[PDB]
Design a protein around this ligand. Structure first.
Ligand SMILES: CCCCCCCC/C=C\CCCCCCCC(=O)OC[C@@H](O)COP(=O)(O)OCC[N+](C)(C)C
Length: 423
């Protein structure tokens, strides 16, 4: 009864998190005009954000494995909300202030995104964990899309680009108050372990890193998740320009309507993919214990041919291409929630924050330092799509390799929880 309200609070804070991530991307051309900057500086904003995020994710993993998770989350939320509200007041003489404030936003969001799913892990069990993680990753893409559209509409109505950063910090003191009042910090593995036992002690951090590098299920699911994130990021970067150029060749248009249509499509396939993936994995898991990574691999390698045929279909019509991309993105998007589950049952509750931090670092590094840096390098159009398909096939092989090792690793972790094995 109280854990449902905790899940509602965490879903709301996740929606706010991605809203604050994308509210500056929904206002980008007026930023490019205000500070007198070219094309590279928007990529510099996003690069500073993701770099601070990746560098400060391991620190908050190490802190959330050993200290009060609710206090660190409250501090992170208060920090990024305060620095956003302060970043609203930057004059046009200094752009590096905007860069530094984006870095601090990245720090706070790294804190929250590293620590938050461990509470959902420690409050529920298998199927209910799967459904509440489904709600969490329902909250991410609606948050991103609504943040873009809210920044854009607030800038259009108010007339100043600064007001795009003034909408989100007002909904941040509410999240801090809710996280202080409603959420109560659960023990590390309260439902995976009886209450009469002494609490589990966190060992050294080097032992945590060696133990997280010695199990193959977690590493291979992280590599599959990395490949999926790379494929989706490159596709979202490439698709609107491709559809515009297709309508240029046909002659319909000699970036607003197609952009909003593709944004609606991305949001709807995100929520439908998370829902369908959790549903199929929960259905199949009872008759097959290795069904989560198999469903991940089926989603990835069954999304591959729909996108592969959309390029051939785009010459004839547009509606069939839209439909086929809508069908492929769902199978691309099951993997978020299913990979979050696969992480949260193969890792000891004294290592889940470090596992989330390592997964964040690996995924964001090999996806976002690679796609806008190598896709644009090899593009300047079919070899980029062939590289995308090769990475997708490698991710499918990684998810099958996860399916080989998921039983032994889940058993070893659940026996380590019960104290029957000692490291
Ligand atoms: C039981 C229910 C209890 C409470 C219910 C509340 C739950 C959540 C509340 C409200 C959300 C509903 C509104 C629908 C959201 C749809 C999002 C939406 O329509 O977004 C508009 C699109 O334009 C966003 O996509 P873009 O940002 O363009 O794509 C990115 C392009 N890029 C180049 C910048 C990378």
């Amino acid at each position: 009864g109280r854990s449902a309200l905790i899940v509602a609070v965490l879903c709301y804070i996740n929606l706010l998190n991605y809203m604050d991530r994308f509210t500056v991307a929904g206002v980008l051309p007026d930023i490019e005009q205000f500070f007198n900057i070219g094309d590279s500086s928007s990529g510099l904003i996003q690069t500073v954000f993701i770099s601070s995020y990746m560098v400060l994710a391991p620190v908050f993993g190490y802190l959330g494995d050993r200290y009060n998770r609710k206090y660190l989350m409250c501090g992170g939320i208060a920090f990024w909300s305060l620095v956003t509200l302060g970043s609203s007041f930057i004059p046009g003489e200094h752009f590096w202030l905007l860069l530094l404030t984006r870095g601090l936003v990245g720090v706070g969001e790294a804190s929250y995104s590293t620590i938050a799913p461990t509470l959902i892990a420690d409050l529920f069990v298998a199927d209910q964990r799967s459904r509440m993680l489904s709600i969490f990753y329902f909250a991410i893409p609606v948050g991103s899309g609504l943040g873009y559209i809210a920044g854009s509409k607030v800038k259009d109505m108010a007339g100043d680009w600064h007001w795009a950063l003034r909408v989100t910090p007002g909904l941040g003191v509410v999240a801090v108050l809710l996280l202080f009042l409603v959420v109560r910090e659960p023990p590390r593995g309260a439902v995976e372990r009886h209450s009469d036992l002494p609490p589990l002690n966190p060992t050294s951090w080097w032992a945590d890193l060696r133990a997280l590098a010695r199990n193959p299920s977690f590493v291979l699911s992280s590599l599959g998740f990395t490949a999926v994130a790379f494929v989706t990021g490159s596709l979202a970067l490439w698709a609107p320009a491709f559809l515009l150029r297709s309508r240029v060749v046909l002659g319909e248009t000699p970036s607003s309507s197609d952009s909003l249509i593709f944004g609606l499509i991305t949001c709807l396939t995100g929520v439908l993919g998370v829902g369908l993936g959790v549903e199929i994995s929960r259905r199949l898991r009872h008759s097959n214990p290795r069904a989560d990574p198999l469903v991940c691999a089926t989603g990835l390698l069954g999304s591959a041919p729909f996108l592969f045929l959309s390029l051939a279909c785009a010459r004839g019509s547009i509606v069939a291409t839209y439909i086929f991309i809508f069908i492929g993105e769902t199978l691309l998007s099951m993997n978020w929630a299913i990979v979050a589950d696969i992480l949260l049952y193969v890792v000891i509750p004294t290592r889940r924050s470090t596992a989330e931090a390592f997964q964040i670092v690996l995924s964001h590094l090999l996806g976002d330092a690679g796609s806008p840096y190598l896709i644009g390098l090899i593009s300047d159009l079919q070899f980029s799509l062939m590289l995308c398909a090769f990475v997708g096939a490698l991710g499918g092989a990684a998810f099958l390799g996860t399916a080989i090792f998921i039983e032994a690793d889940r058993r070893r972790a659940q026996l380590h929880v019960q104290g029957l094995l000692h490291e």
